[PDB]
Symmetry: D2
Subunit: 462 residues, 4 copies
Amino acid sequence: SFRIEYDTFGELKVPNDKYYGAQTVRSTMNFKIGGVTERMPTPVIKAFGILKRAAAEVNQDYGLDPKIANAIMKAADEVAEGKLNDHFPLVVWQTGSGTQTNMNVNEVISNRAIEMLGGELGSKIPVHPNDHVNKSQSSNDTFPTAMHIAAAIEVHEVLLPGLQKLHDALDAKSKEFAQIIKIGRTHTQDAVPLTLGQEFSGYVQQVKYAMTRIKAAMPRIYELAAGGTAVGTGLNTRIGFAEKVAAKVAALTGLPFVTAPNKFEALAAHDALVELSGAMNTTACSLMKIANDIRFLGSGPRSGLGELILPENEPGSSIMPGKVNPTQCEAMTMVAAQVMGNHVAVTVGGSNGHFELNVFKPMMIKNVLHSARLLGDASVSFTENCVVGIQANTERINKLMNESLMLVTALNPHIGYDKAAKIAKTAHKNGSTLKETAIELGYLTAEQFDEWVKPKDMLGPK
Amino acid sequence: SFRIEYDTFGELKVPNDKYYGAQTVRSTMNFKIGGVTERMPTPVIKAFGILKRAAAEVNQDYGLDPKIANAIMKAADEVAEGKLNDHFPLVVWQTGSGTQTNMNVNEVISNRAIEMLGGELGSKIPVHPNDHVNKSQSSNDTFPTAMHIAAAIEVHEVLLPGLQKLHDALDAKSKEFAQIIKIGRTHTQDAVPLTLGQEFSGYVQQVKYAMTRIKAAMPRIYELAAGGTAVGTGLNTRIGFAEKVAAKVAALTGLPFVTAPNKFEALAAHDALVELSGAMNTTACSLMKIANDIRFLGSGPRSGLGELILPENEPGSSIMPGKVNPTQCEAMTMVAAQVMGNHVAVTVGGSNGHFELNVFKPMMIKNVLHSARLLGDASVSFTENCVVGIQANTERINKLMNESLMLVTALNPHIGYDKAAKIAKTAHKNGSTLKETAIELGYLTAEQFDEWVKPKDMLGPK
Amino acid sequence: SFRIEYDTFGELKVPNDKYYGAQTVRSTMNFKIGGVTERMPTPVIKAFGILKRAAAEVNQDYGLDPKIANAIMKAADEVAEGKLNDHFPLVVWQTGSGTQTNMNVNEVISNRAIEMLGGELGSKIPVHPNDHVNKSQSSNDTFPTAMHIAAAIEVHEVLLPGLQKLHDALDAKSKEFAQIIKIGRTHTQDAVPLTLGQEFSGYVQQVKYAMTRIKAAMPRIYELAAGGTAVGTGLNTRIGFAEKVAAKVAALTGLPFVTAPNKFEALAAHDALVELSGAMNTTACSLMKIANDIRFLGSGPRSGLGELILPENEPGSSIMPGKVNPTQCEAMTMVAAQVMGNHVAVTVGGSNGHFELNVFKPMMIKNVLHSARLLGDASVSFTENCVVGIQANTERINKLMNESLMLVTALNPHIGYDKAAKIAKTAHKNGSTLKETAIELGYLTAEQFDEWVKPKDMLGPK
Amino acid sequence: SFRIEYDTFGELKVPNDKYYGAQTVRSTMNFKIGGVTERMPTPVIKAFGILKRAAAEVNQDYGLDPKIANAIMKAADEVAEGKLNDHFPLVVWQTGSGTQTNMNVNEVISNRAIEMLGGELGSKIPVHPNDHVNKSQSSNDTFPTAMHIAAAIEVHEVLLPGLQKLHDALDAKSKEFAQIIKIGRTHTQDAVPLTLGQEFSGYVQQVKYAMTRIKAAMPRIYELAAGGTAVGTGLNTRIGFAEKVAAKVAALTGLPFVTAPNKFEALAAHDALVELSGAMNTTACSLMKIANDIRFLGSGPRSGLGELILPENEPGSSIMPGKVNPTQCEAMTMVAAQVMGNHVAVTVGGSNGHFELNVFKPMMIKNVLHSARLLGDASVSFTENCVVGIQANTERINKLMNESLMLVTALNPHIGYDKAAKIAKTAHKNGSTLKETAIELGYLTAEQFDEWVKPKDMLGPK
C-alpha cells in the first residue's frame, strides 16, 4: 500500500494513493506544528498550479520538450482547479521561504504528469520535479509569486464581490429609509434629527471607501518575484523568463500581473502584503462600526433602542415574542477583531526580513488570505441574512420623536429662547412631551405647535 | 552665557545655567527625533537618582572616598526628588541601551556635587562623572536598572492607588444599588432581571482582578540588572556589588528589589516589561467594558437606555435639559485604547533583542510608564468626576420593568405555559403591558398578577 | 440517505450518518464563513463532552432519571475522547455566545445516547437535547465553561510540556557549552567574552520564566461560569449546581476547577483569556529572541557568525557543503509573530463586552487555543529537530577569540593603558592580532602574552 | 494675578497673562490625565488657527461684521503661526469629540482679537467666542476638520520630506557601491553573490514605495467635516459654508482640501486616519528591515559581518578602536516599533464609533501625528548621521569573497559537477579556499581558476 522513495537521509514510504514524494514526506516528518487546520491555504496551492502551468509553457522557449511541457501544463491545471487538494499535507509552519510547499507542488505535478504519460510514479521519469517542473525557477522566488497570485485572486473573487453585495444592500436600505426621521445620537446622548436613510448612507460610504482602499492596495500585489532566483539577481534563470512568466500568468488569470521592477525588494520584503492587510484592517474598522451600530439599533424589544427589526434566522420560543439576537452582527464583529489581530501578525512578519530574503512568507500570506476570506464571506452572510431583511420600527421611532426634547429649538423663531427653554425644562421635570407642556404653559396652541415644529425642515443647512 | 567643555571630537558650548556636560550636549546634537515632548520620562530620571545614590553609598566598600560619596549622595537625592528635571534634555529616541541618559545623569550629579563642594563646574574635580558617579557600573546595566525602579514605583504610587479608588467607589455604588432591579441585556436584547448592584458587582470584581494581575506581574520587575556590566558576566565590577546595590535600592524605596538571578536574561531581554504591559493590557480590556457600559447606561434622556444619571461637570445649555455627555467615559475608553497600542509597541521591542543586549530599552519603558500613568490618573478622574456621583433613574427603571415582556415566565406555574405565551404575544402585538393584557384576556385578576409576578424572587437559583 | 427533522422555520434534511440534528443544520445554513479550516477547535468540543458528562451525573441530585443520566454520560464520554469529531460542523464565526455549538453538543449527545438505548435518532426520545442534556444549564453559561476547561487542559497537556522539553534541552546544552568562551556582542558590536554556556543560560531562564508566567495566568482560568445561567443570577438553575458541576469537572480532569465567585464578571467578560493570552505573548517575545539568536549564531558557514552547527534535517546538495538553513528557527519565529497577532484579536474581543454578556466568545478561545497549540508544538519541534543536536564550532570560535581586539584590556595591569591602546590601534590598522602586534612593538614577549591574557579570568566580577 | 470669569457652574480664576477663559479653566480641572506631557499636539492647535481664520473670512458672506472678522483673522493667524502655544493647557484625554479644545481655541482667539481692538479681556466684547469665532460651526465638526488639516500638513512638511532625503541618500550609496560584489545571505546562510549597490537598490525601492503608499492614503484625509454640524445634516449652518470653508483652507495651505461628500461618514468614523496610519505602519516595516540590515552589516569589527563602516558620532575609547555602535539604527528601529503600536491604538479608536459621532478623536490624531513626526525626524537623522557617511569595508569584502564556498559553481562548465563538489567538500573540511584546494587536488591551475571564476559574470540571468 506504499511505494519506497529515497532522499539523502534514506528511504521513505509514500502512500500509493498520493502524488507527492520523498521530499514532501520528509517535510511532514519534521514540521508537526498545529495539525491539519494549519495546512497551507488552498488558494496558495491553486496559485502554484497557475504558476507552474505558466512556467512550463514559457520554458518551451528555453529547451523544454513540448511533450513534457504539455503533460506538466495539464497536471498543473488539475492543481489550479482544486482537483488534487488531498495531495498537499504541509502546514504553514514550515521553512520560512515556502520552499517545502514549492517542492510539494513540483512532486505532485511531476507524478500526475508521469501518470498521464503512463509511467511509474516516484520514478521522476519522464517528468522530473526539479529539472522540468521547477525549470528556470528557484527555491526562493516561487512561493512569493504564488502568494501574490493567490492574494490577487482572493481579492477579486471573494473580498471585493462580498463588499460589493453589502454596499448595494446598505444602499437599497438607505433609499428605502430615506423618509424615516429619527433622533440622532452623539456621545450616545439624544441629538438633533436625521433620517435612517442619512445614517445608512454613512455606512454605504464606508463600504464604498473600503473597496477603494483595497483596490489602492493592489498595484504592488500584481508585481511578481518570479525571475529573481536565489537573491534577486536572476542568476541561473534565463533572460526574458521573468517577463514572459508574468505575462503568461496575466493572460491565464485576466489580471494585470507584471514582473517586479526590483527583485531585491520583492524577495527581501513583503511590504505589499503588509499594505493589503492594512487596507483590510481599515475595512474591519468600518465594518465593526456598521455592525455594532445595527446591533444596538435593533436592541430591545422594549429596554433598548428599538429602531430596527432584524430578521430572525434561529428559531425562538413562543413565550419570547419580539426577541431577536443579532447573530450576524456578532459573526461580523468577531471577524473584524480577527482581521485586526491578523494584521499585527502580518506586520511583525513583514518587519523581520534579513538581508536578501524575508523568511516569514507562509505566515504572512496565511493571515492575508484568512482576513480576505473572512471579510468577504462575512459580508455576504451579513448582507443576505441581516441587511436585506432589516425593517424600521416606524411606530416606535415616531413615538420617540414626539417624546424627544430635541425638537424644541424649532420654537425659538416663534416664541423666543426663554419660553422654549422653559418648555424643555418643564417637560423634562414632569415627564411630559414638548407639545403637552407648551400648551399647558399657555405659550401656544396645539395647531401652532403642529405648524411650527416640522422635523422634515430640520434635516439640512438653510 | 556658556562654558567650554570638550570631548575627543572637539569643543562644545555648555550653558552656564545647566549641570550637564559635553557628553550630554553631544548627545542632543545627534538625536533630535520628535522634539521636547519626547524627552525621557521623569520617572526614569528620578529612578536614576535613586540608583546613583545607592551606588555611591555601596562604593565606599570598594574604595570611594566618603567625602566624595556623600556629595554624590546629596546631588543624587536632588535628582531623585525632581529638583533637577530641567537638566535632562535627551529624548527617548536615543541609543537603545540608554547609555546617553546614564551619562546625562552622571554629568549632572558630578557637577551638582562639585558645586556642593565649592569647586568648578565642568572640571570633573573633585567628582568625576565616570570614575566616581559611574564607579563599578557600566554603560549597559544602569538604564535597565533605572527602568525597573521607575516601573515599580509608578505601579505602587500611581497605578494601583488609582485602581483601588475606582474599586472602592464601584463597590459603594454596588451596595447603594443593591435593591434596584432592572432588565438584563444579553446580545443587547432584553433579558431576565438583575439588580444594578449585581451588575456593578461584576465591575468591582474586574477591578479587583486587575489589581491582582498587576501585582502578579511585579515579581520580575523587582529583579535588577545592576552588576551584569557589559554582557552579563560582571567583568569589571566587584564581587558583592550587584547584591549590595539592590539591597540599598530596596531600603531606600521600601520595595522588595533584588538582584536578577541571571544577568544574561536581564540584559538581553526585557520580558518583565512585556509581562507588566500585558497586565495593563488586560486591565485596559476591563476598563473599556466598565466605561462603555456606564456610557450606554447613561444614554438618553429619552432615546437611549436611561438607567443612570451621570454627574454633569461641564456647563450645559438651558434649552437642553437632561442632556449629559459621559465625558469621563470618553477619556477612560481613549486611554484603554492607547494602552492596547502601547502594549504592541512594548511587545515588538521586547521581541527584538540581539545576543547579549536588548537595545529597545528607552521605547519599552516609555510605553510602560505612559500606560501606568494614564490608567492610574484616568481611574482617579473617572472615580471622582463620574462614579461617585452616579445616580439611578429609579422612576424610569421601574416603568421599564413594568413594561417589559421578560417577566412573563413568572406566570407559568400559575396559568401554564400556553396562556403565558399568549399574553406575551398579544402584549407585543398591541403595545400594552403584560398585566393589562393578562386582564383583558380574562386569564387572571390584577390582584393575582401582583401576587404572582414578583421580580425580587427572580434573582437567583432555587 | 437523510432523515427529516423540523424546527420552527420548517423541515430540514439531516444525514443518516450524522448524530447532530435540526438546530445544527439550521446553524450551518446561516453561518457559511471561512470554510472547514474554521471549524470549532477540537479542544472545545472535547471540553463540552467533559462538561455534559459532569452535568448529567450532578443532575441526578435534581430529578434526572439515572438510566437517562448514565446514557448521557457514556455518550458525553465519547465526545470527550474525540470519538465523534465528525459530527461537529459549525465554525468559529457563529453566534457570539457559543450557543450554537452548545446545541450541537446537546443534539449529538442526545442522539448517540438514544442509539445506545436502541431508539430512533432524531426523535428526542428517550433523551431530549434540551430537557435532559442541557438540564440545569443555559444558552449563555455553557460555552464559557467549555472554553476554560479547554484552555486549562491545553496549557497542562500541550503548552507547558512543550516548554518544559525546550527548557531541559537548552539547559543541557548550557552545561555542555559551559567551558566554550566566545566574544560577546552588544549593539551587534564585538564585546567582552562570555561562554556559550552563559549565553544559553539566559535562554534557559527565559523559558523557565515563561512557564512561571503561564502558571501565574491560570488561577482565573480555573473559575467556571456554569451556574450563572442567562445573566449571571442563576435564575432557572438549582442551588448547588454551580459548585457540584465545578467539583465534578475538577474530579474528572484532575485540575483545580472551581465555580467563579462572581458570575456577572464571568459572563460579561473573558479577562482571564486576555490574561492567559498575555502570558503567551510574553512567551512569544522570549522565543523570538532565542530562535533568532540561534539563527544568527548558526549563520555561515563563512560569511556569517559561525558559532553553532545546527542539525541538517532537509537534504542539501553535495556541492554546497556546510550550508544548513535554520528552518526550525523559521517555524518558531513565524509562530511567535502569529501569537502576537492572536493576542491583539483576543484583546479586541475582550474589550468589547456589552452589559451582561460578552459575545466574542468563540473568536477569543479560538485564538487562545491556537497560540497554545502552536507554542507547545513548535517548542517540541525546535527542541527535537534543532536544540538537542546543536554543536559548537569550537575551531572557528577559538580562532576568532585569538583575533579579537576585545581581550586587550587584560594587558593594562602589566604594561599600562597607553601601550595597551597602542597595541589595539596598531592591530586594527594592520589587520594583525593583539599578540603579533604586542611582540612586534616590543612591549612584551610571547610567553608574557600567554601568561597575562587568559580569557578564563575575564568571565566574572573580582 | 487673575481675572474673574464665570460659567453656569460659578466663578473661575483666569490668569491675567493667559488668553483662554472660563470654559478652558473648567476643562483643566476635570481632565488632568497624564500631566503636561499629554497636552494636545501643537499641529492640532495650529490647524485650528487655519480653520478659524478660514471660517471668519467666509462668514462675512453670512452676516459677520468685517471689522470683527478681520480681528479674528489676525488672532487666528497668530495661533496658526505658533505664537500662542502657551495658551493651550488641555490634554489629549478630554472629551472624545475634541469640543473642549475647540472652545479653548475660540476663547484664545476671542481674547487676542479683543486685545487687538483695544477692548477688555474676558468681556466677550466686541468678539464673542461662540457667536463670532465659532459662527456657523459646531462643537462636533470643528475638531475633526482641524485633525485632517494637521495630518495633511505633517505629511507634506515633515514625513514625506524626511523619507525623500532618505530615499536620495540610499540611492547615492547604491550607485557608489554598484561595483562592490559581496556574498548574499538567504536564511542568514551564505548565498550567491550580489553587489552592495543591488542590495541597497532594494532599500531604495522600499522607501520609494513607502512614499507612494503614504500619498495613496491621503485622498480621504483631504476631506473635511466642517459643515456637518451636530450629527452630519448641517442643521444650524448655512448653505455653501461647508464648501466655502474647505476652499478657503485649501487656498491658505496650498493643499487640495475638499468638503467631505458624506458628512455622516466624516463624523461617525475616522477611517481615513486608520488608512494613513496603515501606510505609516507599512513604512515602519520597510524601515525596520533597512535599519536592521545596516545594523548587522556594520557588525564587528572582527566577530560580525563587517561589510560596512558606519560613521561614529559619539566619542569612543582609544583602547577600543574599530568599535562603532549603530546608534541611529537603534533610534530608527525603536521608532518603527512605536509606529506599529500607535497603529493598533488608532485602529481600536477607529473601530469604536457610536451612531452619529466617533468620540475617540483626540487619541486617534495624537497617534497619527506622533507616528508621522517620528518617522520624518528619524529619516532625516538616520540619513544625515548614518547613511550619507557609510563606507564599504572593501578589503574585508574581497577577502570573504575569495574565502567563500559559494563561487564553486563557476567551475562546473569547465571541470564538471563532480570535481566541483569534491573541491567544495575538501575546502570545507580543511578550512582552505576553493582555489587552494582546486590546485592541491590537481583539477586545474591557478591561471585557469582566475579565468573561470569571475564573480562579475554571476550577477544576472543569461
